[PDB]
Motif scaffolding. Structure first.
Motif, short mmCIF file in Angstrom:
data_model
loop_
_atom_site.label_atom_id
_atom_site.label_comp_id
_atom_site.label_asym_id
_atom_site.label_seq_id
_atom_site.Cartn_x
_atom_site.Cartn_y
_atom_site.Cartn_z
N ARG A 128 5.14 -7.42 14.55
CA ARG A 128 5.36 -6.20 13.43
C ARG A 128 6.32 -5.97 12.28
N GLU A 129 5.23 -7.33 11.83
CA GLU A 129 5.76 -7.90 9.77
C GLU A 129 5.64 -6.35 8.99
N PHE A 130 5.05 -5.37 9.58
CA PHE A 130 4.52 -4.35 8.68
C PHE A 130 5.92 -3.87 8.51
N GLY A 131 6.96 -3.90 9.40
CA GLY A 131 7.79 -2.76 9.29
C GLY A 131 8.95 -3.26 7.85
N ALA A 132 8.98 -4.40 7.53
CA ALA A 132 9.75 -5.20 6.52
C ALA A 132 8.72 -4.88 5.15
N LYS A 133 8.16 -4.14 5.32
CA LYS A 133 7.65 -4.02 3.62
C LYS A 133 7.25 -2.59 2.95
N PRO A 134 7.64 -2.17 2.54
CA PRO A 134 7.88 -0.92 1.63
C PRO A 134 6.08 -0.55 1.33
N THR A 135 4.52 -1.32 0.75
CA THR A 135 3.61 -0.97 0.95
C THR A 135 3.39 -0.50 2.50
N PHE A 136 3.78 -0.55 3.12
CA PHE A 136 3.54 -0.28 4.67
C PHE A 136 4.67 1.38 4.48
N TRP A 137 5.25 1.55 4.09
CA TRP A 137 5.65 3.12 4.79
C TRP A 137 5.80 4.14 3.38
N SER A 138 4.95 3.33 2.74
CA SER A 138 4.36 4.71 1.28
C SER A 138 2.78 4.98 1.81
N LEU A 139 2.35 4.08 2.15
CA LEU A 139 1.13 3.84 2.28
C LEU A 139 1.15 5.02 3.83
N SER A 140 2.32 5.35 4.65
CA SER A 140 1.85 5.64 5.92
C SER A 140 2.25 7.31 5.68
N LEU A 141 3.59 7.73 4.29
CA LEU A 141 3.73 8.52 4.03
C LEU A 141 2.63 9.36 2.83
N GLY A 142 2.06 8.59 2.10
CA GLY A 142 1.16 9.28 1.60
C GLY A 142 -0.22 9.26 2.76
N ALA A 143 -0.38 8.84 3.19
CA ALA A 143 -1.08 9.37 4.23
C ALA A 143 -0.99 10.50 5.31
N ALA A 144 0.35 10.14 5.26
CA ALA A 144 0.89 12.17 6.36
C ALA A 144 0.88 13.25 5.45
N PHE A 145 0.15 12.81 4.19
CA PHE A 145 0.41 13.81 3.31
C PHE A 145 -1.06 14.49 3.08
N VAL A 146 -0.94 13.26 3.08
CA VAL A 146 -3.09 13.46 2.95
C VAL A 146 -3.53 14.40 4.03
N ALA A 147 -2.72 14.09 5.56
CA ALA A 147 -2.91 14.88 6.30
C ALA A 147 -3.33 15.99 7.19
#
Length: 465
Positions: A222-241
């Protein structure tokens, strides 16, 4: 498994999943009908079609997933299929908005336990040699389900309660003919009941014919949690959704209020095409992420979010246009650009994590995109629509007239509203039109996150060297 038997199990599960999406999304086809019946605020409609799927994932999928791992057989699916089938017909039978809202949560709870079992089922049935094909086939349920909801919902709406009551009586079910004034049964109720009911039979067939495969079988051996790229890609997708869910929730009310299409036409001639288009753009944006990576990842024309920024005018054109033909075509362009960035952000999220960890990476990301996009999108679009109407009413002093407003009268009984009935109907159209535009402006917020992701991407990237 077995050469044709596991193929049957796969078809059965894919069908369940299609039916899952049919039940889930058909609510948007009959939106304005349900609204007319209960004289609902667009704020309320956003509420009904958003937050109730906080229980779909966050509060039920995680529990059921654990149940499947240390639990029982195919039963868990066939049990859930019955639950969300029953809850879907109960929606047809709902007495009030709150009853409708309760039943909807029940559908959400039931559907939480579709895929987690079905992935395990398929995995044990299928050899690693071919698990991915099986699962890709299964996944098609979303696309087919979305399009079928717009087709079956469209067709079934405009069926008169009298029509259905004659039919039931003719096939030997006068126990339902007696006691019900079928002439006063709303079409949107038939949609829910016709769609939800046969799923109980389906569940029974599944349970009788699908054998619980031995856990871990696959005999063709679950190493993605330390990465700001992950949270950015998540939010941008949550706003596309967010935008997608907002718009879908009010898509047909718009088309009806603003352009006078019938419920069936809204769903058949626009709904189902646009659903396909949205899936097409989704697949396209992941494909292009894969294809165009010539040792250059996070692919996108410079100023990364610019594709989303193009969708915003195409959307706004579609809403503001008086030509419905241009509304459709602009909408098609806007959905392609728009849903492309959905699939792009999905693909890029697997580029920043080790292969063993991509499953949990996508899982968390989708939980995020569900809660924020589905949970808030429709709710924003509704509230803004109600609010924008409010402002028109204030500016035109319509408060006295509005106190007796009932959306349904706009259909053809505007005089019955009063002196200012036509005013109120145009306010009902324009409130939503203005909210649709406000909604898609959130693609600015999405594009902002996409850009932010591209800033940290090459530090957070995953490389095998």
């Amino acid at each position: 498994g077995s050469k044709p038997y596991r193929s049957y199990v796969l078809l059965a599960l894919t069908l369940i999943y299609t039916l899952n999406f049919i039940d889930r999304t058909v609510i948007t086809v009959v939106a304005q009908p349900i609204i007319n019946t209960f004289s609902l605020s667009d704020a309320q409609w956003g509420l009904l079609t958003g937050p109730p799927f906080a229980l779909f994932y966050a509060l039920m999928g995680i529990p059921i997933a654990m149940w499947a791992d240390r639990g029982n057989r195919v039963f868990i699916i066939s049990l859930c299929v019955i639950i969300w089938s029953i809850m879907t017909v109960f929606c047809g039978l709902a007495a009030s908005f709150i009853w409708l809202l309760l039943f909807r949560v029940g559908v959400a709870i039931g559907e939480a336990g579709c895929t987690p079992p079905a992935n395990s089922i398929i995995t044990d049935y299928y050899p690693p040699k071919s698990r991915a094909n099986a699962i890709g086939i299964y996944s098609m349920g979303v696309t087919v389900g979305g399009v079928m909801a717009q087709l079956f919902g469209g067709a079934l709406a405009g069926l008169q309660g009298a029509d259905f009551g004659n039919f039931l009586s003719s096939i030997g079910l006068g126990w339902l003919f007696s006691g019900i004034n079928w002439e006063e049964v709303e079409g949107w109720r038939l949609v829910f009941v016709i769609v939800g009911a046969p799923g109980i039979l389906v569940a029974l067939i599944l349970w009788l014919t699908t054998r619980e495969p031995p856990r871990g079988y696959s005999d063709p051996k679950r190493e993605f949690g330390a990465k700001p790229t992950f949270w950015s890609l998540s939010l941008g997708a949550a706003f596309v959704a967010f935008v997608g869910y907002g718009l879908i929730s009010f898509q047909a009310p718009f088309l009806m209020r603003v352009h006078g299409v019938s419920v069936s036409e809204a769903a058949i001639r626009y709904g189902a095409p646009l659903a396909a288009v949205a899936a097409f753009g989704t697949f396209l944006g992941g494909f292009l992420s894969e294809k165009f990576t010539p040792r250059f990842p996070a692919i996108v024309a410079w100023l990364p979010g610019v594709g989303l920024l193009i969708a915003i005018p195409a959307y706004i054109a579609a809403f503001l246009t008086p030509s419905l033909t241009m509304a459709f075509w602009m909408w098609v362009i806007a959905a392609i650009a728009h849903y492309a960035y959905l699939g792009a952000q999905y693909t890029v999220s697997t580029a920043i994590v080790s292969p063993r960890s991509r499953a949990t990476t996508v899982s968390v990301l989708l939980l995020i995109v569900s809660l924020i996009g589905n949970g808030l999108g429709p709710m924003f679009t509704g509230m803004m629509s109600s609010a924008f109407m409010g402002g028109i009413i204030r500016k035109n002093g319509l408060e006295e007239a509005f106190a007796t407003f009932n959306p349904g009268l706009c259909a053809g009984r505007m005089a019955e509203i009063g002196e200012m009935g036509p005013a109120l109907c145009s306010a009902y159209a324009e409130g939503l039109r203005q909210s649709m535009v406000a909604t898609v402006v959130f693609l600015v917020i999405a594009a902002a996150f996409y850009f932010l992701a591209s800033r940290t991407f090459l530090k957070d990237r995953w490389s095998p060297a």
